[PDB]
Structure 1
């Protein structure tokens, strides 16, 4: 096992799924979790057989069943549930299933053995009760932060199978932003218009690098450490207002991000950054079909035989919902101000007053925990 061999495969697949999601979200805010969807699909591997299993193993690039795959994955989850987790991130996977289905012998114990947790049984014939329960389990397993994951809308008598994934993150900066150096400021939407939003400021030695699109536009990559350095945020945007964020989105990969960090250098800057707080339900169906995982939504074609042996089964709904707060510090509404040794020495100014991209990486492993674009802060 090359170090973090699995971790790198997951984040990877996780990033690939993300492109998909960004392609479908031009001009909208999105926050997403590469890790989450990777974990949830790894689980699903066990409920599946035939081509349905194949489509996933081919898309994820490892087989959950082989030697040390599940072993390495729970260890990953442990590293991320580390003691350093001062309640910064809550995480939840859940596979829900209609209630009177003969589960194939061995499934439960096996699932518990490789994954802990278990498949949750509910009665979808009971209308709104069933979502209510799914929504409650989700709320409580994400420190109350994510509510209505399962939409008042769809899911009916006939729904028999549903995956859910949900994360919440509110991280504590290594150096958090002065409260006093936060002031209003114009943010330029992509359509050129203009909006007055609160931007944070902090002047500091950042890790920094400048890359270029294939179409020859320059763009900034900036690393923000979180406490004790387990995680970092990466911020990226094209220099030129005129350039849509897509130029970046459409080329994002796991490897690109490596190149970014690899290629960084500590440099003094003044950083103006919008304070922001996003919550996005992502529907997984299209992104997954697009990576080859078609069978799993399809009656008469999906192969759930590793789970149930009274045929008819297919995934009704595959939802991830994510909330991320970035604003000054996780801390008791009030962060360490105000210090500044600022004459006319002014270091260069990087201002995120245009749409931009963010990435939260768990540093030892390289896992992209979260990912997103800020369109209107």
Structure 2
């Protein structure tokens, strides 16, 4: 059961990422597949009718079913354990109107399943409501993500806000020597070149070569973090002309697990560029393409499990991810666009995903 829900959370989150990357061609994007699954699973308890059916059908599981929520509670405790060492910061929050009569029994049931509460804020005080959302993210990401650019859209009419924020800056198992860091040329998808600092180290890295259904070769390299608890999978096509879209559209939790199994250690000189990327995305259009259309529509939305008094709808759905990648004879030069995956090896959870077009 804990490995089963982690597989469903990863599969759903990859499908959301595949939609955000489709509308972000030739541009840097960082997304948390595990993060978007957590907020959507919490929202599954606030919904009713056909609105609740649309989320359950896309996610592949019902949150009220036996052993579904205790498996996610065990997963979060495992991911935020003693190994953490201030590398990851996860936060999930749902905001609703303060003077709104909630269904008697919702609040105790919500805390029983996620060990969290739905925050009640007055949206009449626009600037005060904007501060509470930004301050909640600030205090729960240890001050890494302090502001959300999407909060500038909330007003006196806003009644429901969905927010998720993730931070990553992991410690490598075998760190990169700072003396090897030098500025190298990076080729862009349009044909232009840019000079960016690149890390280098000689080690026995896990390597594999896979093929796309079209018939194009692509290589995968594994970079483990301290205690092998986490690993970064760098995916890039063999041919310089092949775009990253071909590799993105075929992603899944099974494929990443299949990459690890077919991998064999090889002595190489890896040249990986340094990148500190940040991306904030509105989840209206990506969740709409997956089937969840009702939750955003004013009259078609059903949130009877949260409140039957006033009609509600998701006015704002956001995710802000900040990833940091720093230092702490055959060669592999990563000097062209590539894909990255941050996997939690014991459960197989896809924590982070993205495409680096320009570091």
Q: Indicate the TM-score class for this superposition, using the shorter chain for normalisation.
A: over 0.9
Q: Which runs of 5+ in 2 are unaligned?
A: none
In 2, Cα distance between equivalents of 1:127 and 1:60: 33
* Alpha-carbon contact 1:90-1:167 (below 8 Å) kept: yes
3-state SS of the aligned residue for 2:189?
Answer: coil
3-state SS of the aligned residue for 1:6?
Answer: helix
TM-score by length of 2: 0.97
* Alpha-carbon contact 1:181-1:200 (below 8 Å) kept: yes
| Deviations 1:256-295 (CA, angstroms, capped at 9, x unpaired) | 2122112111111111000010100011111111111111
* Alpha-carbon contact 1:135-1:150 (below 8 Å) kept: no
Shift of 1:117: 1.1
Task: Pick closer, same or farther for the CA change 1:152–1:38 going to 2, 3 Å.
Answer: closer
Shift of 1:127: 1.8
Count of matched residue positions in the alignment of Structure 1 and Structure 2: 358
In 1, Cα distance between equivalents of 2:313 and 2:181: 50
Shift of 1:206: 0.8
In 2, Cα distance between equivalents of 1:120 and 1:46: 15
Shift of 1:214: 2.5
In 1, Cα distance between equivalents of 2:182 and 2:242: 26
* Alpha-carbon contact 1:131-1:150 (below 8 Å) kept: no
Shift of 1:13: 0.6
Aligned Cα RMSD in Å? 1.7
In 2, Cα distance between equivalents of 1:50 and 1:268: 57
Task: Pick closer, same or farther for the CA change 1:199–1:266 going to 2, 3 Å.
Answer: same
Shift of 1:140: 1.5
Shift of 1:99: 1.0
Deviates more, 1:246-255 or 1:64-73: 246-255
In 2, Cα distance between equivalents of 1:221 and 1:181: 23
TM-score by length of 1: 0.93
* Alpha-carbon contact 1:178-1:201 (below 8 Å) kept: yes
* Equivalent position to 1:353, from 331, 335, 341: 335
In 2, Cα distance between equivalents of 1:324 and 1:55: 31
In 1, Cα distance between equivalents of 2:309 and 2:149: 26
Shift of 1:98: 1.2
* Alpha-carbon contact 2:26-2:189 (below 8 Å) kept: yes
Shift of 1:152: 5.6
In 2, Cα distance between equivalents of 1:88 and 1:302: 38
* Alpha-carbon contact 1:134-1:150 (below 8 Å) kept: no
